Scaffold this motif. Structure first.
Motif, PDB file in Angstrom:
ATOM      1  N   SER A 124       0.863  -1.208   0.000  1.00 61.57           N
ATOM      2  CA  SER A 124       0.000   0.000   0.000  1.00 61.57           C
ATOM      3  C   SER A 124       0.887   1.243   0.000  1.00 61.57           C
ATOM      4  O   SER A 124       1.988   1.161   0.559  1.00 61.57           O
ATOM      5  N   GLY A 125       0.432   2.333  -0.619  1.00 65.13           N
ATOM      6  CA  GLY A 125       1.170   3.584  -0.617  1.00 65.13           C
ATOM      7  C   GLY A 125       1.403   4.126  -2.017  1.00 65.13           C
ATOM      8  O   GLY A 125       1.092   3.492  -3.020  1.00 65.13           O
ATOM      9  N   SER A 126       1.986   5.322  -2.067  1.00 65.67           N
ATOM     10  CA  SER A 126       2.309   5.979  -3.329  1.00 65.67           C
ATOM     11  C   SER A 126       3.730   5.660  -3.778  1.00 65.67           C
ATOM     12  O   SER A 126       4.569   5.208  -3.001  1.00 65.67           O
ATOM     13  N   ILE A 127       3.954   5.852  -5.085  1.00 65.00           N
ATOM     14  CA  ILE A 127       5.265   5.497  -5.702  1.00 65.00           C
ATOM     15  C   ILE A 127       5.836   6.722  -6.423  1.00 65.00           C
ATOM     16  O   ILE A 127       5.034   7.550  -6.895  1.00 65.00           O
ATOM     17  N   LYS A 128       7.162   6.835  -6.493  1.00 65.74           N
ATOM     18  CA  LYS A 128       7.869   7.961  -7.165  1.00 65.74           C
ATOM     19  C   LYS A 128       8.705   7.453  -8.342  1.00 65.74           C
ATOM     20  O   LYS A 128       9.623   6.648  -8.093  1.00 65.74           O
ATOM     21  N   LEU A 129       8.392   7.906  -9.561  1.00 65.40           N
ATOM     22  CA  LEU A 129       9.198   7.537 -10.757  1.00 65.40           C
ATOM     23  C   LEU A 129      10.013   8.762 -11.178  1.00 65.40           C
ATOM     24  O   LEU A 129       9.395   9.783 -11.530  1.00 65.40           O
ATOM     25  N   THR A 130      11.345   8.660 -11.146  1.00 63.13           N
ATOM     26  CA  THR A 130      12.212   9.820 -11.485  1.00 63.13           C
ATOM     27  C   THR A 130      12.816   9.595 -12.874  1.00 63.13           C
ATOM     28  O   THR A 130      13.383   8.512 -13.094  1.00 63.13           O
ATOM     29  N   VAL A 133      12.558  19.890 -20.436  1.00 62.72           N
ATOM     30  CA  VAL A 133      13.972  19.590 -20.228  1.00 62.72           C
ATOM     31  C   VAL A 133      14.785  20.881 -20.228  1.00 62.72           C
ATOM     32  O   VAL A 133      14.610  21.740 -21.096  1.00 62.72           O
ATOM     33  N   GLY A 134      15.694  21.011 -19.264  1.00 59.79           N
ATOM     34  CA  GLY A 134      16.528  22.189 -19.140  1.00 59.79           C
ATOM     35  C   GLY A 134      17.683  21.996 -18.185  1.00 59.79           C
ATOM     36  O   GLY A 134      18.328  20.951 -18.205  1.00 59.79           O
ATOM     37  N   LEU A 135      17.948  22.999 -17.344  1.00 57.67           N
ATOM     38  CA  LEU A 135      19.053  22.936 -16.390  1.00 57.67           C
ATOM     39  C   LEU A 135      18.911  21.751 -15.443  1.00 57.67           C
ATOM     40  O   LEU A 135      19.806  20.906 -15.351  1.00 57.67           O
ATOM     41  N   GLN A 136      17.766  21.672 -14.754  1.00 61.72           N
ATOM     42  CA  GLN A 136      17.463  20.515 -13.867  1.00 61.72           C
ATOM     43  C   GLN A 136      17.179  19.324 -14.786  1.00 61.72           C
ATOM     44  O   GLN A 136      16.181  19.382 -15.525  1.00 61.72           O
ATOM     45  N   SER A 137      18.012  18.279 -14.758  1.00 60.80           N
ATOM     46  CA  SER A 137      17.844  17.167 -15.733  1.00 60.80           C
ATOM     47  C   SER A 137      16.881  16.084 -15.229  1.00 60.80           C
ATOM     48  O   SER A 137      16.597  15.159 -16.012  1.00 60.80           O
ATOM     49  N   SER A 138      16.386  16.189 -13.992  1.00 58.76           N
ATOM     50  CA  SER A 138      15.545  15.091 -13.443  1.00 58.76           C
ATOM     51  C   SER A 138      14.127  15.569 -13.116  1.00 58.76           C
ATOM     52  O   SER A 138      13.996  16.639 -12.496  1.00 58.76           O
ATOM     53  N   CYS A 139      13.108  14.795 -13.506  1.00 54.38           N
ATOM     54  CA  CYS A 139      11.698  15.140 -13.168  1.00 54.38           C
ATOM     55  C   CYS A 139      11.052  13.947 -12.460  1.00 54.38           C
ATOM     56  O   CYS A 139      11.338  12.806 -12.863  1.00 54.38           O
ATOM     57  N   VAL A 140      10.203  14.198 -11.460  1.00 53.79           N
ATOM     58  CA  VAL A 140       9.616  13.074 -10.670  1.00 53.79           C
ATOM     59  C   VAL A 140       8.110  12.983 -10.938  1.00 53.79           C
ATOM     60  O   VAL A 140       7.427  14.018 -10.812  1.00 53.79           O
ATOM     61  N   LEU A 141       7.620  11.792 -11.293  1.00 61.35           N
ATOM     62  CA  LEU A 141       6.162  11.582 -11.498  1.00 61.35           C
ATOM     63  C   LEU A 141       5.635  10.759 -10.319  1.00 61.35           C
ATOM     64  O   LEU A 141       6.011   9.574 -10.213  1.00 61.35           O
ATOM     65  N   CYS A 150      15.195   5.844 -15.802  1.00 61.53           N
ATOM     66  CA  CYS A 150      14.098   5.821 -14.842  1.00 61.53           C
ATOM     67  C   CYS A 150      14.539   5.196 -13.526  1.00 61.53           C
ATOM     68  O   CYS A 150      15.271   4.209 -13.512  1.00 61.53           O
ATOM     69  N   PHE A 151      14.088   5.784 -12.424  1.00 65.29           N
ATOM     70  CA  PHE A 151      14.321   5.307 -11.069  1.00 65.29           C
ATOM     71  C   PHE A 151      12.983   5.183 -10.361  1.00 65.29           C
ATOM     72  O   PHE A 151      12.102   6.017 -10.553  1.00 65.29           O
ATOM     73  N   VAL A 152      12.847   4.121  -9.564  1.00 67.41           N
ATOM     74  CA  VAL A 152      11.594   3.862  -8.796  1.00 67.41           C
ATOM     75  C   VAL A 152      11.930   3.819  -7.304  1.00 67.41           C
ATOM     76  O   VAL A 152      12.844   3.082  -6.916  1.00 67.41           O
ATOM     77  N   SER A 153      11.192   4.600  -6.516  1.00 63.69           N
ATOM     78  CA  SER A 153      11.346   4.689  -5.043  1.00 63.69           C
ATOM     79  C   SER A 153       9.950   4.765  -4.413  1.00 63.69           C
ATOM     80  O   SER A 153       8.999   5.091  -5.140  1.00 63.69           O
ATOM     81  N   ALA A 154       9.848   4.486  -3.111  1.00 64.88           N
ATOM     82  CA  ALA A 154       8.538   4.492  -2.420  1.00 64.88           C
ATOM     83  C   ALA A 154       8.353   5.797  -1.644  1.00 64.88           C
ATOM     84  O   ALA A 154       9.368   6.355  -1.182  1.00 64.88           O
ATOM     85  N   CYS A 155       7.107   6.263  -1.508  1.00 61.00           N
ATOM     86  CA  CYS A 155       6.819   7.459  -0.734  1.00 61.00           C
ATOM     87  C   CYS A 155       6.727   7.115   0.750  1.00 61.00           C
ATOM     88  O   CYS A 155       6.857   5.964   1.159  1.00 61.00           O
TER      89      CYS A 155
END
Lengths: 269, 57, 256, 238, 79, 269, 238, 57, 125
Positions: free
Chosen positions: G111-117, G158-166, G212-217
Motif C-alpha cells: 500500500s502507498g504511493s510510488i515515485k518515478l524519477t 527539459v533544461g538545467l534541472q535534468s531530473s523530473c519526478v512523477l 528511470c528510477f523507482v522509489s517508495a513514498c
C-alpha cells in the motif's frame, strides 16, 4: 571487570620495573605500559566463564553398565566414584580439596537381543535404581527382600519418560573431600597406599521390575555427575600422563612436551 | 518470597527465582560469583615488593 | 552571492577546484574520525602521519570509448605503492582510514553519456570456474584500473573473474547498486563526482594487505556519443585522499 | 487444574541446564566448614602464576630437564640468535603444557597481554647483554638482529638483578584469538639475539644457561569452555 | 580447503595439492592421490607435508585431503 | 505510524518540487500533493512487519542428514553454517554485517529399513546430539570416549517427545558477523579467497544411544536456525543469480530481468 | 504438585513461536558493540531508495546495459508514445527485480504511493517536452496522447534541472493490493508521450536516452511475510 | 518482577512477561522496535536540499 | 631505596635497561623539543611521526681489539636506511631532530681499558 590499559609516554629515570629477582618466588606484576608507550584502552572483558563453578558445573558421563531381563546378569551394581572416567577426573584434580553438592542424572536404554523366539509382543519396561549407603545390606538376587527400600533411597522409572534426576548433598565425614592422600589407613604403614574412607559414597543397584516380553532384552544405564555449589583449595599441576588405574595415581613416564626441529623453528614437528 | 536478579548481558535486565524445596542442596548453581584474589598464589612474600624498586638491594 | 556548482577541497599540500559539481555525498552521514578509547582493542600507541598520509593521490587515466563496459579499483591496493601512505602500510601490521574519492571527466555540450560512481563495501567477486576462486592478479591492479567485460567470461579450469558488467562481478543486478554511497556523472549537467567514505569494518582495525574494505566502480549506463569533428579522446581521472589515517604494529617492512 | 501448554524442549536432557531438583536425603546436616589455605575462585588466578617454559624441546631433550635450559656461550661475533617461537599460547608445543597452556586448552578463545621472565644462571663474573624481541604478524619472522630491532624489544643487561621481564602486549585486529592454529588470528613471533657477547675471566665457565617463565597479565581472559585434546581413554580405568 | 581445486597441467610433472585446515578440523590427517600413493600416521615433494603441502612429483589425478570433520578434493588433468 | 496525506489546492508559483538533479545521489522526497490536488487522508497503517527482527525471526531448515543403528554410517557430523540452504542465506545477505543470538531446534525421525530379519520387536530409541567448539576432540567412532561430554554441550532425546531446543549467543571473536569478505587469510594474498575465521561456529555430531531392535533402522536429523535480537548494517543488492557453492559467491551470468514483447506491452512474455 | 491441565497445541513446533529457552553456554561474555555506519531497522528504509528500472527489457537487451536505456529521437511528427507499463510493483518484470520489487516479493500485500524519477542524458543543446501519464483502471490503456492527457499527468520540460519526478498516488478501492497478479486489485497504466519533438543543432546527436528510477513514498507499507519465488534449490550447496 | 506491555491491536490491551533464565540470550525476540531513520541511505548529501528550491543553482 | 647505577630508558616500542651506568649527559643542558612559531621560517604544516620515528635503532657491532684506534658514525647517515626515519628523510626536503645515543660494552673485572664516547658538532674532516 578485567583491568583497563593506562596510557603512558616516554621515560628516562632510575625506575626499573623490568628488572627483578625470580628467586624470591614472586610473579612480577608489570603492565605493558612499563616497557613501551601505550594508549588508553577501556577494557569491557569479563572473567565470568573462568569461575570454579562454571568450569566444573556441567554433567559428565562417569560410568555405564548393562543388565538383562533373563539369564545370569539380571541386575547391575557400581560403587559411586568419579575416577573411572578421564575428563571429570582430570578437571577435579586441578585442586587438592573440593567440597560440592551433586546432581545425578541417569540415561537408561534397552535393545532387543537376537533369538529364535516367535510371537514376541513386549510390554513397557519399568526400572528400579537403588542407592545403598556404606554399611547396609546389598541384594544377592533380583528378587532379594532388600529391594523393599524401607529406608534406602529408590527411583522407579518407565521407558519413554524424562530421565530421572536427584540432588545429593556433601556427605564427607571430613570437612572437605580429598583428591590426593599421601598415607595409609593402617598406623603400621603396611597395606594399600593412597587409600582412605573420606570420599566413600556407597553403591548403586539397577534392575528391571518386570520382564516385559517373552524374548530377550538388554538394558544399559549411564550415570551423570554435575558438581554444584563448589569450593576448592590448593591448586595443583595438571595431569601430564595417561591415567592407568582408578584407585591410585600410577602412570607411565612421558616427555615434558612435544618436540620441534630446533630452538628457532616456528612450527610443530 | 521471589528473588529478582540481573541477567548476564553485553557491554557497550532481570529474572525471577523462587525456591521450591527445603534442603538448599536442591537449589541452582551459583554462576554469578565474580570474586578474585590472586595475591595468595602470586606475590606471596613476607616483605612487600614495589614494582619500580630493585627486588634485592 | 556564489554558485553551488563551484566547490574547493583542500587536504594536506593538495587542493582540487571544480566549477561544475552536483554536491558532496557523505558516506552514511558519517564524517571520518579517529578511533576512540572505548572502542579500541590494541594497546600500543598509534601513529598519525596526518598531512604526510592524508592528501590527494592521482592515479592513471582511463579512456572512455563508445563501447567501454566500466572499471574498478580496490582503494587500499590503489594507494599501496604511493608515497608515505604506502610506506606506512608496508611497515605496520594494522591500519585504519577513510577516503575522499573525486572522479573527473569533462567534455563539451555535444558530448553525451552518463557514468555511475559508487563506493561498494566488501565487493567480493566470483571466478569464471565455479570450483576455483579468482586469482589475486586478476582481482587487484595497484597502479592500473581493472576493466569489466560486456560478454560473459569462459570457464575452463582458470582463475579468471566473471567480469560481466550487468552482474557487477558480484552476481547481483547492476541497477540496484544505488543503496551504496554514489553519484552520477552526466555529461550535460555534471563534470565531477565526490564521495566521502568513513571507515567500514566489523573489526576496529585491520591488516591492509590481505583485506580490501572498499572498491570504487565507474560504470557507464548511457554510452559516450558525439557527432564527427568533436574530440574523440575523452579521459577519466581518479583522485583519492585518505582521511584520519592511523597505524599500529610496527615491525620489519614486507607482506608475507 | 490451571491450563498450561508445553513448549518444545520439554523432557530433554541438556547437560548444561540449571534447574532445582528434589534431594534424595531430606534434612541431612553437612559437616561445617573449616578455614583452609589457598582457596581458588577463578581459573585466572592460576594462569597469572609463572611456570617454566620448555624452549629446548628438541629430540630426546623432552625426556630430561634439558628441555627447560636455554644454552648461551661466548662467540667470536655478535648478533646471532638465541631462540625463537610464535605467539601461540595454547597451540605451540612450547606453551601448550605450561600452567597457562593447560588452562587455555579448555577454552576456544583467549585475550590479553603475556609476561615472559628470563633469569640468568651463569657465574656471577659472567656478563652479557641480550635483545628480546616481539614482531606482530604481516611479515615473516626476523632472520637478523637488525630486522628484530624494528619491533617491540627490550635490551636486557645482566647484573645484580638476575631476572628481566618481556611484556607482549595485545596487538590484534579482533578482540579475541583462537587457541587452536589459525592464520586469520595470527599472533606474531618472539625472538632473542646477542646484543653483546658473553665475557668471562679465566677459570670461569664460558657456557651458561637461561630460564624462561610465562605468566598472564591483569587484562587476560578466556571464553567458550570445551573439552581438552590432552587426556583420552579406551576402557574404564580400574 | 585446497587452492585451485580444478586445473589442467600440460607438459617431471609437479602436481600441487596445497591445503588449509579449519579450526574445527582436529581428526587424524589422511592424504590420498588417485588415477597411486597414500599418506597415513610417484613421490611427495615436501618432507613437512603435514604443514599443508600434499604435492607429488610424477589422465585425471585426484588429491583427497581428509581431516575430520573437513573433506576436500582437487582434480588435475595431466596431458 | 506511517505518514498521513496532506490536503492541497491549486498552485501557480516559482516553487518547483517536481524538478531536481538525480546526479546528486539524493532520492527526491516529494509527496503526491506536490503535483496534484489531494484530500486529507489520515493513515492508520503501520510498518510493524518490515522490522529486521520480524523479517529474520522465523525458524528455517538449514541442513538435514542421516545415520543408521547398524552398518558403516553409525553417526552423523556437520559444520554449523547457514550458507548450505538458499532461503535464509538470501535473506541474511541483504546486509554486510549482522549480529544475533540463535535459537536452535531439531526434528529427528526414524524409518524401518527393508531386510529379511524376523521376530523384530523394537525398543524406544534415544539420540544424542553433541556440539564441539572449534579446536576440541572429535569422535572417530560411535563408542568414542569423547561422547563423555564432560565440557562439550550435549542433548539427549527420546522418540515421541517434543523437539529439543536450545539458545546460543553471539560467539564471534569480531564485533559483528560478516556475510562478505573481500580478502585472504594469508598476508601473501595466496590461498583461498573470501574465506576467514570470523563466522566459525563449530561442528555437530549425532548418534543413537541404543540400537533398539534386531532389524535395521535409519534416522534423519533436521536442523533449524532462528535469529534473535538482531542488528544489521550496510544494505546490499539482493542475489539476482542461483547460488552454486556454499563457500563462495560464484555464479552463472543471468539476464537483469524477464523479457516482454515491446516497450509498450502491458503483459509479461 | 500444583494441579494443571494441558491444552491443545502442547509439544508442537510452530516455526513462528516466541518463547524463552535454556542457553547451552551459561555466562558467556559476548564481544562488545562498536559503532558501524549504515544501520538498518526497517526494510522500508531500503525501499525508499531509488534504483534504476529496466524498461527496455525486450529480447537480448536484458543481457546488456541496454535494458536500462529508454531511446528517444527527433520525429517528423508529435504525440507518439515513448513507453508504457502497468502499476504492478512486485509482479511486472519491469519492477519485480528492482530494490522495491525484491523487497515486495517477500510480502503478500502492499500500500502507498510510488515515485518515478526520469533523467535526460542527451546533449546540453538537445531540448524536449514530454508528457508522463498515469491512468487508474476501468478503461483500457490509452492508445493516444489525448486519451492519456485525461488522467494524472505531468508535462516535463527539459533544461538545467535534468531530473523530473512523477508521483503515482494511491487510488484504490481497498486499503491494500496483492503483490501477485490479480484483476480485482488492478493498479492502472503508466505511459509516456512526446509533448514536443526533440530539437538539436547541427553536429549534435539527434538520438538520446532517458533513465528511470523507482522509489517508495512515506505512506508505503507491506504485509503478510512469505517466501520469495526468485531463489530455488535442487541439492545442498557446497 | 513482572513486565506489563501492550499487545499489537487494530485501529479505528496488555500482556505479562517474566524471565526465567539468567543469560539474556534466553529471552524472547524484540518484535516491537518501530524506530526508523531513512536519512542515511536516502538524501545523504553534505548540503541540505529543500524540496521547492532548484537542486542546482 | 635504589641504586643510581641502574637506569631504564623507554622510547616508542623500545626500552633499554643498564645495571652499571655513570649517569646521563644532557647536551648543553638543553632537552630536545619541537620548533616554535616565533623561530620558524618554512610555512607549510610539518609532520611529526613520533613513536614511528622516535625509537631506538641498533646498529652493527664492532670488535674492540688490543690495537684498535677507534670508530666514527655520522648520526643522520647512520639511520638514513633504517625504518620510517629513513623513509621520512627520503620523501622530505627539510628535517629536524635530536638524539639519545647509548654505547654498550661489557667485560669481566680482569678486563681493563677506557673509551671516550663524544658527540662532536660539525666534525668536518
Amino acid at each position: 571487570r578485567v583491568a583497563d590499559t593506562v596510557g603512558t609516554g616516554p621515560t628516562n629515570s632510575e625506575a626499573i620495573p623490568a628488572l627483578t629477582a625470580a628467586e624470591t618466588g614472586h610473579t612480577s606484576q608489570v603492565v605493558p605500559g612499563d616497557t613501551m608507550q601505550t594508549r588508553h584502552v577501556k577494557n569491557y572483558h569479563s572473567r565470568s566463564e573462568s569461575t570454579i563453578e562454571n568450569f566444573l558445573c556441567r554433567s559428565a558421563c562417569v560410568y555405564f553398565t548393562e543388565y538383562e531381563n533373563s539369564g545370569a546378569k539380571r541386575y547391575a551394581e557400581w560403587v559411586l566414584t568419579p575416577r573411572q572416567a578421564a575428563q571429570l577426573r582430570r578437571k577435579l584434580e586441578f585442586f587438592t580439596y573440593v567440597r560440592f553438592d551433586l546432581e545425578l542424572t541417569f540415561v537408561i536404554t534397552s535393545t532387543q537381543q537376537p533369538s529364535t523366539t516367535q510371537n514376541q509382543d513386549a510390554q513397557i519396561l519399568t526400572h528400579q535404581i537403588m542407592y545403598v549407603p556404606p554399611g547396609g545390606p546389598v541384594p544377592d538376587k533380583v528378587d532379594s527382600y532388600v529391594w523393599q527400600t524401607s529406608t534406602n533411597p529408590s527411583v522407579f522409572w518407565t521407558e519413554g519418560n524424562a530421565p530421572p534426576r536427584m540432588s545429593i548433598p556433601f556427605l564427607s565425614i571430613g570437612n572437605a573431600y580429598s583428591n590426593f592422600y599421601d598415607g595409609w589407613s593402617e598406623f603400621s604403614r603396611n597395606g594399600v597406599y593412597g587409600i582412605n574412607t573420606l570420599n566413600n559414597m556407597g553403591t548403586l543397584y539397577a534392575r528391571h521390575v518386570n520382564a516385559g516380553s517373552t524374548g530377550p532384552i538388554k538394558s544399559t544405564i549411564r550415570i551423570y555427575f554435575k558438581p554444584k555449589h563448589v569450593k576448592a583449595w590448593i591448586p595443583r599441576p595438571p595431569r601430564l600422563c595417561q591415567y592407568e588405574k582408578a584407585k591410585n595415581v600410577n602412570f607411565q613416564p612421558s616427555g615434558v612436551t612435544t618436540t620441534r626441529q630446533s630452538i628457532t623453528t616456528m612450527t610443530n614437528t | 518470597g521471589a528473588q529478582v536478579s540481573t541477567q548476564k548481558t553485553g557491554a557497550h535486565i532481570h529474572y525471577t527465582n523462587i525456591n521450591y524445596y527445603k534442603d538448599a542442596a536442591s537449589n541452582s548453581a551459583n554462576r554469578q560469583d565474580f570474586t578474585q584474589d590472586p595475591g595468595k598464589f602470586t606475590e606471596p612474600v613476607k616483605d612487600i615488593m614495589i614494582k619500580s624498586l630493585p627486588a634485592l638491594n | 552571492g556564489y554558485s553551488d556548482r563551484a566547490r574547493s577541497i583542500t587536504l594536506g599540500n593538495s587542493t582540487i577546484t571544480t566549477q561544475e559539481c552536483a554536491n558532496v555525498v557523505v558516506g552514511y552521514g558519517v564524517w571520518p574520525d579517529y578511533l576512540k578509547d572505548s572502542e579500541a582493542t590494541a594497546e600500543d600507541q598509534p601513529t598519525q602521519p596526518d598531512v604526510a598520509t592524508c592528501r590527494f593521490y592521482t592515479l592513471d587515466s582511463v579512456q572512455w570509448q563508445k563501447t567501454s563496459p566500466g572499471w574498478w579499483w580496490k582503494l587500499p591496493d590503489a594507494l599501496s605503492n604511493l608515497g608515505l601512505f604506502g610506506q606506512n602500510m608496508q611497515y605496520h601490521y594494522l591500519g585504519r582510514t577513510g577516503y575522499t574519492v573525486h572522479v573527473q571527466c569533462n567534455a563539451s555540450k555535444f558530448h553525451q553519456g552518463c557514468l555511475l560512481v559508487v563506493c561498494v563495501p566488501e565487493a567480493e567477486m566470483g571466478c569464471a570456474t565455479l570450483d576455483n576462486t579468482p586469482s589475486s592478479a586478476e582481482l587487484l591492479g595497484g597502479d592500473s584500473a581493472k576493466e569489466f567485460a560486456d560478454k560473459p567470461v569462459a570457464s575452463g579450469s582458470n582463475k579468471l573473474v566473471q567480469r560481466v558488467v550487468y552482474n557487477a562481478g558480484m552476481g547481483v543486478g547492476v541497477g540496484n547498486l544505488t543503496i551504496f554511497p554514489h553519484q552520477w556523472i552526466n555529461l550535460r549537467t555534471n563534470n565531477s563526482a565526490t564521495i566521502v567514505m568513513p571507515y567500514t569494518n566489523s573489526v576496529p582495525m585491520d591488516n591492509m594487505f590481505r583485506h580490501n574494505n572498499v572498491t570504487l566502480m565507474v560504470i557507464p549506463f548511457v554510452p559516450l556519443d558525439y557527432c564527427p569533428g568533436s574530440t574523440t579522446y575523452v579521459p577519466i581521472t581518479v583522485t583519492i585522499a585518505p582521511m584520519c589515517a592511523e597505524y599500529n604494529g610496527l615491525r620489519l617492512a614486507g607482506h608475507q | 487444574g490451571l491450563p498450561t501448554m508445553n513448549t518444545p524442549g520439554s523432557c530433554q536432557f541438556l547437560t548444561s541446564d540449571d534447574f532445582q531438583s528434589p534431594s534424595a536425603m531430606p534434612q541431612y546436616d553437612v559437616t561445617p566448614e573449616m578455614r583452609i589455605p589457598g582457596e581458588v575462585k577463578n581459573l585466572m588466578e592460576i594462569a597469572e602464576v609463572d611456570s617454566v617454559v620448555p624452549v629446548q624441546n628438541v629430540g630426546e631433550k623432552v625426556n630430561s630437564m634439558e628441555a627447560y635450559q636455554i644454552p648461551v656461550r661466548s662467540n667470536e661475533g655478535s648478533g646471532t640468535q638465541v631462540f625463537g617461537f610464535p605467539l601461540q599460547p595454547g597451540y605451540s608445543s612450547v606453551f601448550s603444557r605450561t600452567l597457562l597452556g593447560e588452562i587455555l586448552n579448555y577454552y576456544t578463545h583467549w585475550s590479553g597481554s603475556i609476561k615472559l621472565t628470563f633469569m640468568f644462571c651463569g657465574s656471577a663474573m659472567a656478563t652479557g647483554k641480550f635483545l628480546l624481541a616481539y614482531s606482530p604478524p604481516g611479515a615473516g619472522a626476523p632472520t637478523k638482529r637488525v630486522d628484530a630491532m624494528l619491533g617491540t624489544h627490550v635490551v636486557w643487561d645482566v647484573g645484580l638483578q638476575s631476572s628481566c621481564v618481556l611484556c607482549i602486549p595485545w596487538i590484534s585486529q579482533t578482540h579475541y584469538r583462537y587457541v587452536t592454529s589459525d592464520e586469520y588470528t595470527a599472533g606474531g613471533f618472539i625472538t632473542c639475539w646477542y646484543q653483546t657477547n658473553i665475557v668471562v675471566p679465566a677459570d670461569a665457565q664460558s657456557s651458561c644457561y637461561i630460564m624462561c617463565f610465562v605468566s598472564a597479565c591483569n587484562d587476560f581472559s578466556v571464553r567458550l569452555l570445551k573439552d581438552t585434546p590432552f587426556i583420552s581413554q579406551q576402557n574404564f580405568f580400574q | 580447503s585446497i587452492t585451485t581445486p580444478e586445473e589442467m597441467i600440460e607438459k617431471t610433472a609437479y602436481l600441487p595439492c596445497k591445503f588449509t585446515l579449519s579450526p574445527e578440523d582436529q581428526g587424524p590427517l589422511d592424504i590420498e592421490w588417485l588415477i597411486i600413493i597414500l599418506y597415513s600416521g610417484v613421490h611427495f615433494t615436501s618432507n613437512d607435508l603435514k604443514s599443508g603441502d600434499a604435492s607429488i612429483n610424477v589422465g585425471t589425478y585426484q588429491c583427497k585431503v581428509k581431516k575430520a570433520p573437513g573433506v576436500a578434493n582437487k582434480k588435475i588433468h595431466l596431458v
